[PDB]
Amino acid sequence: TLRAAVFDLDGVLALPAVFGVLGRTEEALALPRGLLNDAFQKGGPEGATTRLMKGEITLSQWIPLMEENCRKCSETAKVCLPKNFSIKEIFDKAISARKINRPMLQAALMLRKKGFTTAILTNTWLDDRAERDGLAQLMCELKMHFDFLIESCQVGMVKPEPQIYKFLLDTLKASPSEVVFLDDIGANLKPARDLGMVTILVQDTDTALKELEKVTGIQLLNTPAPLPTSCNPSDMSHGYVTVKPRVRLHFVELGSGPAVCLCHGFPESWYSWRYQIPALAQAGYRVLAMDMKGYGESSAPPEIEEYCMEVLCKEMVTFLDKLGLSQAVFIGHDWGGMLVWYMALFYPERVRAVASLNTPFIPANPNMSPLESIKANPVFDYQLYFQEPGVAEAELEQNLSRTFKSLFRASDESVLSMHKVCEAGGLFVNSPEEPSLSRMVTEEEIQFYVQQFKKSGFRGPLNWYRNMERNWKWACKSLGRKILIPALMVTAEKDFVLVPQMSQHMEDWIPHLKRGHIEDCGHWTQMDKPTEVNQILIKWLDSDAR
Amino acid sequence: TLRAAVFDLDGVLALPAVFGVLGRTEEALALPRGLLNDAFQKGGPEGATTRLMKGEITLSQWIPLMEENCRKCSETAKVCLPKNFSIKEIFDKAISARKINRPMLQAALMLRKKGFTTAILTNTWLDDRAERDGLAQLMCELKMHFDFLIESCQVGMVKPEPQIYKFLLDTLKASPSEVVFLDDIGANLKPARDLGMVTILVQDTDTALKELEKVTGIQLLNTPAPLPTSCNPSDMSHGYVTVKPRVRLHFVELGSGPAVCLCHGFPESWYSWRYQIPALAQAGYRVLAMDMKGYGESSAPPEIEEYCMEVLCKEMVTFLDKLGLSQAVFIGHDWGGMLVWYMALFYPERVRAVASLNTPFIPANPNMSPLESIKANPVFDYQLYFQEPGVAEAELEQNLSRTFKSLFRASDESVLSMHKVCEAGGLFVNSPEEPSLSRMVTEEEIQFYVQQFKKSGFRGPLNWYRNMERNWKWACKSLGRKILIPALMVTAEKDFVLVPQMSQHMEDWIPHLKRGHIEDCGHWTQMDKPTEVNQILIKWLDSDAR
Ligand SMILES: Cn1c(N)c(N2CCCCC2)c(=O)[nH]c1=O
Ligand SMILES: Cn1c(N)c(N2CCCCC2)c(=O)[nH]c1=O
Ligand SMILES: [Mg+2]
Ligand SMILES: [Mg+2]
């Protein structure tokens, strides 16, 4: 029967509440108990604060009204306000003090995931203070997780007036007995209750979640640790830049602050960074998640040499130029990892910082041809399989579902040995027709990649492996150099190809190199361990790219 | 015969040159004359500096090599280097000291405009210093104006080695006698001269321009003040955001730093900001130039109410939300101007600063219906003409060329009175079939707008005028408020509709309002006076949005 959950903001989705800054201030300053609260509510439905909450006047216009209220209350209470008493100051601090109550957001997220319509209904104000960005940020971080946000000052109504609850019901398209509504103010519950809504009086969070959990019959408390926020492809800003006549690059873009350019591996997509994109934006960065050349909505010319590193890097430079970016932080995985190390080596003026997941930096060997080098590691045999134009294409294109469902698997779920791929005749010769779904991905996610690869298939992506000689000769030019810009290498314990030991000599070429290491993590790092990837990246960005 | 011009960077396109920081430093510090220069060149083709300029080693690797050179030179000159002597320090300062030599860039721009292929050919380095962004910025600002930039450290060759000039010729696809090449170092000219290139030894800029002007037969010196940099539509990053199921907004995006969202008027385009887009990026801002709803590559639903202010503003808010932007600066012109004032009034938490060109803020009159209000000004008659769906569409769509060529004219070139448009039967009933081209626009520019309006025509744009009652009622909600965030109103002397006197009472509603005023400037502000618009905006952004 319950179909919808509605949350207040102050004291429910965000803590501490401001009403409790009035109380704390009165104490701190030894003012009569309740004095500030009395000034706040002065005049009831006709007072300054209701005008504020209804959108009639802005925060800044209200501040001196509260001021006057406070003087009038202190005069009748026959006390003096303290020299330097300041409403602006009290509220500035209160508004910046208040953070998202994570357990409550997590319970709302959970209810939405099992099918609840969720809404935030709040008494709030039009904030024109110099410091208003703070609150704008909070509301953005919160509102994205909900079906609706109803704000008193946008609708001209306030809790507890009954018309707002009618407006709520109509927005939900639900009847009162389908709604649970949580608030920290009992008078605000009363009208919800009159209509027959389940209402929860929120004091400490855990008790309200207990009541919410009992009343919905869904686990909300003690639940396992949830994944980071993912990206819905059709809610993203999509960007397109032509870097030369036949080639346009596509990217998804989110957030503001230093530019951070994300470069995926083979055979992937911008969407491989779906767990990192909202977290890095949230952390104060401008994320640009690419489709690399050959993929998704980026161009995919047929010719092998279009995909050598030299050209790929020059095109990434052109990308910054057309976007008007003097630098970006470059973070890559797998092939995207090899590329960013090259950006570091050939265009350090354009790289604010560099990081790689899985892909080590190993200088080219000027004496050994890369083909020969490759034969020296049984686990790189798949690379030789990939050389002959057409062969890997036909296997990889034959059944896209099975391709992604076979590749994208956690380390304890593998279905492809990387062993003697050439001899076997294929990458999948000995894996199922219909693979089971990895714990790492939903069916919908597999299908996005399938739809992406329907545009150009595997020729462009495979081409990235078909320039071993050209990249070797180019890389040899850089053997005298070191990487001396900020740099982060992230190893993944259970990547059986890019093993962590392959990265061991990196400090000889990158002496100030920083590291993270992720246990129990296979090759598809970003989706296998998205929580730990995000922590290691944000911590490194904040300390080394900021 | 001369088809190509080639410029050096240090001492030609950028001043002061660094070689002249070696000289200045020796003086400043009372070291033997030439000592630093000797350490710099130590070892000639095999020395640290040639390795640097060839890309073998990075700037940071080079610094201690120069150091050692300097010690060895001071030992043989039997002098002491000064306590705290520091190469890193000397070059940090030198590299940040050096700016674009504007008269030289302006001469290159001019030669390119009359058909020269232009190139920058420079001895430079792979810069990995903590401060490398400085140089990255300079190179970006410079390189966009040229056909090629050839860098010693990317090609593995250096001036004066002859192979670089051969590489130059091949890049130009020109023969030596078609090339003028300018350098401040005579030894670098010598090989150009051996091949039969016109060469110019650059000491003071003006003399070299005199020689360049005589040798090309094109005026370069004393030329009139050029326009700001414009945008080539196909070199821009194009962005797309879906704000709700039927509506996607298109924008062009350039630069990094605080977000600045540009909102054009009727019947315009993102491209109306082509003169401001490169200047504001260059000034340290992230520009987002919209196609507003109804225009260009943004969606254009048929229904009138899709274009009322309330919906338009909510959709702009959604736009920030999906881009992950807590705020943008909003700068509008004409209709875009009315909109940004509404963003200021209804979402001040989301507006970092607001500016309008031409469009004043005039509070809705709660006693007078807006239709009646509109009849009160003979020069708003065109607004009534625009009400009847279909009528203005048919006139405006009939001949797109003539539409834009009639509208887009400077104030002394007008062809349409705004007088009794209804009575006359149209906006163009008494203007030419084939109008002449305004000084403000080239034929190509008129045609971009024509191509844009071929996608959706004039229904969506006209709709912006068809919600006078709905916007009035909405605007009445805001009559108690003031705008107290930073705000800039720009009047244009010769706009005969949005006259400057219409803005006179603005300080009653916006008490800290700043102003600029542009003389001799008609309605199409951004293109009529792009240089003065840019100065007034950058100066206001830098002081009020920063
Ligand atoms: C299971 N696995 C795995 N499939 C890969 N591939 C990445 C994509 C191309 C083929 C190899 C890897 O690099 N490391 C692994 O551990
Ligand atoms: C010449 N002129 C002019 N055409 C306009 N229009 C803008 C576009 C819609 C019709 C009116 C104006 O607002 N001010 C002017 O001075
Ligand atoms: Mg509350
Ligand atoms: Mg020079």
Short mmCIF file of N, CA and C in Angstrom, two decimals, chain B residues 383-462:
data_model
loop_
_atom_site.label_atom_id
_atom_site.label_comp_id
_atom_site.label_asym_id
_atom_site.label_seq_id
_atom_site.Cartn_x
_atom_site.Cartn_y
_atom_site.Cartn_z
N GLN B 383 5.32 44.14 -30.67
CA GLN B 383 4.94 43.05 -29.78
C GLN B 383 3.51 42.54 -30.00
N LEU B 384 2.62 43.42 -30.47
CA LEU B 384 1.24 43.07 -30.67
C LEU B 384 1.13 42.37 -32.00
N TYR B 385 1.90 42.88 -32.95
CA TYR B 385 2.02 42.22 -34.22
C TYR B 385 2.38 40.75 -33.93
N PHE B 386 3.29 40.49 -33.00
CA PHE B 386 3.78 39.09 -32.74
C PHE B 386 2.81 38.13 -32.04
N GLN B 387 1.64 38.61 -31.63
CA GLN B 387 0.71 37.77 -30.82
C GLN B 387 -0.04 36.62 -31.55
N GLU B 388 -0.54 36.91 -32.74
CA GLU B 388 -1.47 36.05 -33.45
C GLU B 388 -0.70 34.89 -34.04
N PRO B 389 -0.91 33.68 -33.51
CA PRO B 389 -0.01 32.67 -34.07
C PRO B 389 -0.10 32.55 -35.60
N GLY B 390 1.05 32.62 -36.25
CA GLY B 390 1.13 32.33 -37.68
C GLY B 390 1.45 33.57 -38.47
N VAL B 391 0.96 34.71 -38.01
CA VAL B 391 1.12 35.92 -38.80
C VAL B 391 2.58 36.35 -38.97
N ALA B 392 3.31 36.55 -37.85
CA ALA B 392 4.71 36.97 -37.92
C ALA B 392 5.56 35.83 -38.47
N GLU B 393 5.18 34.59 -38.15
CA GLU B 393 5.92 33.44 -38.70
C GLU B 393 6.03 33.54 -40.22
N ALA B 394 4.92 33.81 -40.89
CA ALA B 394 4.87 33.75 -42.34
C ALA B 394 5.77 34.87 -42.92
N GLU B 395 5.66 36.09 -42.39
CA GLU B 395 6.59 37.16 -42.80
C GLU B 395 8.04 36.82 -42.50
N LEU B 396 8.34 36.45 -41.27
CA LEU B 396 9.74 36.20 -40.91
C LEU B 396 10.35 34.99 -41.62
N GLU B 397 9.54 33.99 -41.94
CA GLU B 397 10.05 32.73 -42.58
C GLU B 397 10.14 32.81 -44.11
N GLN B 398 9.52 33.82 -44.66
CA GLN B 398 9.30 33.82 -46.08
C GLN B 398 10.63 33.90 -46.82
N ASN B 399 11.56 34.69 -46.29
CA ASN B 399 12.85 34.92 -46.93
C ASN B 399 13.87 35.16 -45.81
N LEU B 400 14.54 34.10 -45.36
CA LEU B 400 15.40 34.20 -44.16
C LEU B 400 16.54 35.19 -44.28
N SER B 401 17.21 35.13 -45.41
CA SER B 401 18.24 36.11 -45.77
C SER B 401 17.81 37.57 -45.55
N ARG B 402 16.65 37.91 -46.08
CA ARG B 402 16.15 39.24 -46.04
C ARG B 402 15.78 39.55 -44.59
N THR B 403 15.22 38.57 -43.89
CA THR B 403 14.91 38.75 -42.45
C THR B 403 16.15 39.20 -41.66
N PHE B 404 17.20 38.38 -41.66
CA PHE B 404 18.40 38.73 -40.92
C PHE B 404 19.11 39.96 -41.45
N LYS B 405 19.30 40.02 -42.78
CA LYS B 405 19.83 41.24 -43.39
C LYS B 405 19.02 42.53 -43.06
N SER B 406 17.70 42.47 -42.96
CA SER B 406 16.92 43.64 -42.45
C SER B 406 17.08 43.99 -40.95
N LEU B 407 16.98 42.99 -40.07
CA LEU B 407 17.12 43.16 -38.61
C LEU B 407 18.52 43.56 -38.17
N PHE B 408 19.51 42.78 -38.58
CA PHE B 408 20.87 42.98 -38.11
C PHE B 408 21.54 44.17 -38.79
N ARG B 409 21.27 45.39 -38.30
CA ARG B 409 21.84 46.58 -38.94
C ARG B 409 22.26 47.53 -37.80
N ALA B 410 23.29 48.35 -38.05
CA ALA B 410 23.85 49.28 -37.05
C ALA B 410 22.90 50.46 -36.99
N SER B 411 23.05 51.35 -36.01
CA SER B 411 21.95 52.32 -35.79
C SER B 411 21.72 53.36 -36.93
N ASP B 412 22.80 53.71 -37.63
CA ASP B 412 22.77 54.59 -38.82
C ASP B 412 22.48 53.88 -40.18
N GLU B 413 21.84 52.70 -40.13
CA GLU B 413 21.69 51.86 -41.32
C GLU B 413 20.30 51.27 -41.29
N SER B 414 19.47 51.73 -40.34
CA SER B 414 18.18 51.07 -40.06
C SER B 414 17.37 51.03 -41.34
N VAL B 415 16.51 50.03 -41.52
CA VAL B 415 15.62 50.01 -42.70
C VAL B 415 14.17 49.79 -42.28
N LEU B 416 13.99 49.45 -41.01
CA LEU B 416 12.68 49.22 -40.41
C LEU B 416 12.44 50.25 -39.33
N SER B 417 11.40 51.05 -39.52
CA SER B 417 10.87 51.81 -38.43
C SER B 417 10.18 50.76 -37.58
N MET B 418 10.15 50.97 -36.28
CA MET B 418 9.34 50.13 -35.42
C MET B 418 7.91 50.71 -35.28
N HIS B 419 7.63 51.73 -36.08
CA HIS B 419 6.38 52.52 -35.97
C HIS B 419 5.16 51.90 -36.70
N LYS B 420 4.05 51.80 -35.99
CA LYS B 420 2.81 51.25 -36.51
C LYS B 420 3.02 50.03 -37.44
N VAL B 421 3.58 48.99 -36.83
CA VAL B 421 3.82 47.71 -37.46
C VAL B 421 2.49 46.99 -37.76
N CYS B 422 1.57 47.01 -36.81
CA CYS B 422 0.25 46.39 -37.01
C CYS B 422 -0.53 47.00 -38.20
N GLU B 423 -0.62 48.33 -38.18
CA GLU B 423 -1.28 49.13 -39.21
C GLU B 423 -0.65 48.91 -40.61
N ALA B 424 0.69 48.85 -40.67
CA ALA B 424 1.41 48.61 -41.92
C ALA B 424 1.19 47.20 -42.42
N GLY B 425 0.91 46.25 -41.53
CA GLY B 425 0.70 44.87 -41.93
C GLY B 425 1.93 43.97 -41.77
N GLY B 426 3.04 44.55 -41.30
CA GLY B 426 4.28 43.79 -41.18
C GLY B 426 5.50 44.58 -40.76
N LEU B 427 6.53 43.84 -40.41
CA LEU B 427 7.78 44.41 -39.94
C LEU B 427 8.62 44.89 -41.08
N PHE B 428 8.40 44.30 -42.26
CA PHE B 428 9.20 44.57 -43.51
C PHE B 428 8.40 45.13 -44.69
N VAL B 429 7.12 45.38 -44.48
CA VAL B 429 6.23 45.87 -45.54
C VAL B 429 6.85 47.03 -46.29
N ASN B 430 7.73 47.78 -45.63
CA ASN B 430 8.31 48.97 -46.26
C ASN B 430 9.85 49.02 -46.28
N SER B 431 10.46 47.83 -46.41
CA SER B 431 11.91 47.65 -46.56
C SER B 431 12.28 46.75 -47.79
N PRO B 432 13.56 46.79 -48.27
CA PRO B 432 13.89 46.20 -49.60
C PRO B 432 13.75 44.69 -49.69
N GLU B 433 13.72 44.18 -50.91
CA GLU B 433 13.63 42.74 -51.17
C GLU B 433 14.97 42.19 -50.90
N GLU B 434 15.98 42.79 -51.51
CA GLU B 434 17.35 42.45 -51.24
C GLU B 434 18.07 43.58 -50.48
N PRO B 435 18.01 43.57 -49.15
CA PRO B 435 18.76 44.56 -48.38
C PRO B 435 20.29 44.49 -48.62
N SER B 436 20.98 45.61 -48.45
CA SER B 436 22.44 45.62 -48.49
C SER B 436 22.93 45.01 -47.18
N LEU B 437 24.20 44.61 -47.19
CA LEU B 437 24.84 43.97 -46.08
C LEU B 437 25.23 45.03 -45.04
N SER B 438 24.87 44.83 -43.78
CA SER B 438 25.32 45.77 -42.76
C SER B 438 26.83 45.70 -42.57
N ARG B 439 27.47 46.83 -42.22
CA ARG B 439 28.91 46.83 -41.82
C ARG B 439 29.15 45.83 -40.71
N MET B 440 28.11 45.51 -39.96
CA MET B 440 28.32 44.64 -38.79
C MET B 440 28.55 43.17 -39.11
N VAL B 441 28.07 42.72 -40.27
CA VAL B 441 28.10 41.30 -40.59
C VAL B 441 28.66 40.99 -41.97
N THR B 442 29.35 39.88 -42.08
CA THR B 442 29.71 39.38 -43.40
C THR B 442 28.57 38.50 -43.98
N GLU B 443 28.66 38.14 -45.26
CA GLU B 443 27.57 37.39 -45.93
C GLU B 443 27.45 36.01 -45.31
N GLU B 444 28.62 35.43 -45.01
CA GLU B 444 28.76 34.11 -44.37
C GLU B 444 28.07 34.09 -43.04
N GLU B 445 28.32 35.11 -42.20
CA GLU B 445 27.59 35.20 -40.96
C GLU B 445 26.03 35.27 -41.09
N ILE B 446 25.50 36.09 -42.00
CA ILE B 446 24.05 36.10 -42.26
C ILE B 446 23.60 34.65 -42.53
N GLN B 447 24.36 33.92 -43.37
CA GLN B 447 23.99 32.54 -43.79
C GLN B 447 23.98 31.46 -42.67
N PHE B 448 24.90 31.56 -41.70
CA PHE B 448 24.81 30.75 -40.49
C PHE B 448 23.45 30.95 -39.82
N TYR B 449 23.07 32.18 -39.54
CA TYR B 449 21.76 32.36 -38.94
C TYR B 449 20.69 31.76 -39.87
N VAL B 450 20.78 32.00 -41.19
CA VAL B 450 19.75 31.46 -42.09
C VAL B 450 19.66 29.94 -41.94
N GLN B 451 20.82 29.25 -41.87
CA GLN B 451 20.84 27.80 -41.74
C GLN B 451 20.24 27.40 -40.38
N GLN B 452 20.61 28.11 -39.31
CA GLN B 452 20.02 27.81 -38.02
C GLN B 452 18.49 27.89 -38.07
N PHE B 453 17.93 28.95 -38.66
CA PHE B 453 16.49 29.10 -38.63
C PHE B 453 15.70 28.16 -39.56
N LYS B 454 16.41 27.46 -40.42
CA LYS B 454 15.83 26.43 -41.22
C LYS B 454 15.42 25.21 -40.43
N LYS B 455 16.06 24.96 -39.28
CA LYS B 455 15.66 23.84 -38.41
C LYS B 455 14.24 24.06 -37.82
N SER B 456 13.97 25.18 -37.15
CA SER B 456 12.64 25.27 -36.55
C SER B 456 11.87 26.52 -36.89
N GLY B 457 12.43 27.48 -37.63
CA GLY B 457 11.71 28.70 -37.91
C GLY B 457 11.33 29.51 -36.65
N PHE B 458 10.21 30.21 -36.75
CA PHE B 458 10.01 31.38 -35.89
C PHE B 458 8.91 31.19 -34.87
N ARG B 459 8.28 30.02 -34.89
CA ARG B 459 7.21 29.69 -33.95
C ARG B 459 7.64 29.68 -32.46
N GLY B 460 8.65 28.87 -32.14
CA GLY B 460 9.28 28.85 -30.83
C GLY B 460 9.81 30.22 -30.38
N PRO B 461 10.69 30.85 -31.18
CA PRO B 461 11.12 32.21 -30.82
C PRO B 461 9.98 33.21 -30.59
N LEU B 462 8.96 33.22 -31.47
CA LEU B 462 7.84 34.15 -31.35
C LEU B 462 7.09 33.83 -30.11
#
